[PDB]
Swiss-Prot record:
Chemical reaction(s) catalysed: UDP-N-acetyl-alpha-D-muramate + L-alanine + ATP = UDP-N-acetyl-alpha-D-muramoyl-L-alanine + ADP + phosphate + H(+)
Gene source species: Mycobacterium bovis (strain ATCC BAA-935 / AF2122/97)
Keywords annotated in UniProt: ATP-binding, Cell cycle, Cell division, Cell shape, Cell wall biogenesis/degradation, Cytoplasm, Ligase, Nucleotide-binding, Peptidoglycan synthesis
Gene transcribed to yield this protein: murC
Record bears the keyword Kinase: no
Pathway(s) per entry: Cell wall biogenesis; peptidoglycan biosynthesis
Domain of life: Bacteria
EC number(s) reported in the record: 6.3.2.8
Protein name: UDP-N-acetylmuramate--L-alanine ligase
Compartments (UniProt record): Cytoplasm
NCBIfam families: murC
Family the UniProt entry places it in: Belongs to the MurCDEF family.
Amino acid sequence: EQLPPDLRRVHMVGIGGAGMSGIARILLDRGGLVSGSDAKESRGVHALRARGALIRIGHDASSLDLLPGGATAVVTTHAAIPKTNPELVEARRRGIPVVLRPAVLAKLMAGRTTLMVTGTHGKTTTTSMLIVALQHCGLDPSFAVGGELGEAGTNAHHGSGDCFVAEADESDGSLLQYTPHVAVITNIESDHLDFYGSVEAYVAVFDSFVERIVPGGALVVCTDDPGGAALAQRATELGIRVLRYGSVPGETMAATLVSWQQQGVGAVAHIRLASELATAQGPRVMRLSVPGRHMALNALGALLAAVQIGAPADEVLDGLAGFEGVRRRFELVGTCGVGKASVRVFDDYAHHPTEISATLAAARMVLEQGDGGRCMVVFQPHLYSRTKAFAAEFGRALNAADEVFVLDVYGAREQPLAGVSGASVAEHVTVPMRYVPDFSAVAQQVAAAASPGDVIVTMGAGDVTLLGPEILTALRVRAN
Ligand SMILES: [Zn+2]
């Protein structure tokens, strides 16, 4: 019905980021005044300026005079903006509150039925599936999706509905700012510990989050994941409603993946829903337009979340059938040639060994619908520390491909470690492999190694996504 007083005139430091931009859009659509600052001009800055936001390029204290009567709050994000930023200093000097993005999002979600999706990976896809399912059922939920894949998949919308669907980051402690009515948890793996220092504290963030669920709420949780299954048990012992989904049958399972197959038109799964949800007809068929069995598991999570707020299961399944995937999630970049002899180039954000194995299994199942292609992966390791810790597991996961090109480590503002490179991963791969540390040489080499019917996947969380188009060009030039 209203914005809280602290959110009426908001100045956003780093407003050009996709998450900050979505928050600013929602603020504006609910009658807020927004000013901001960013290091670099971009299309998001232009769009926000066009909607009435006063945005200065570059950070400077004067930006705090843009709003009439001064800013009621300054919104930053600790991951991107340092505490030594001039505008944060000026804000603390005048006594203007400084908040992080998740607190603002929590204030925006207040008064709605909130569906939060978290987990180590698969958050963006599951949140997007849930949003698409709800919209297919005629609803107009508010939402804020994105984060896990960087800018990819990030979007936000102020809706007329009573629901608010949000992706919750678990890598920086944002989880604990939220109060979910329905909490979905895709998995809990031993990663993203850089903020927590230990597996134990990271796992504990999820227990605290589960405790934050409103009375009478529900936790949808994947139980094929070990951390997820343990957390589901712990949550059941707290008295909380627990909707489990996975592949192992059980009396305490809300939804079960009985079978899954990849076909030429798309994927098809057979599932069993608990009799409490939906109807007595036992086995349901769930078709999907996205490849991969793990996508069917994600879809089960979104389905249970949607049913919890009163959407009919069959119509939700219809809506999930039309989900097309998000950017950098086995995303088709392009095709060279036609039919069975065509070479397809895909893009994927996978950077955890489980993600790598899942993506390569999906690629192999896609290949099995063709007539004899090969799977070539172009993998860019994501961090020096991650590479040093996980190189053996990375190479083991990459062994699922027919050919592997390994790029050098993408640093991502991390301090370089002596003795660590992409070759640290390349040492552990058993299948045909090439180490290509020169970025500009990659595309050509891949184009030379391609055969008709091949599936090519650029994989990684950094620069590697830019190689998809180039490869295609280098393939079409090769077509003489
Ligand atoms: Zn990650």
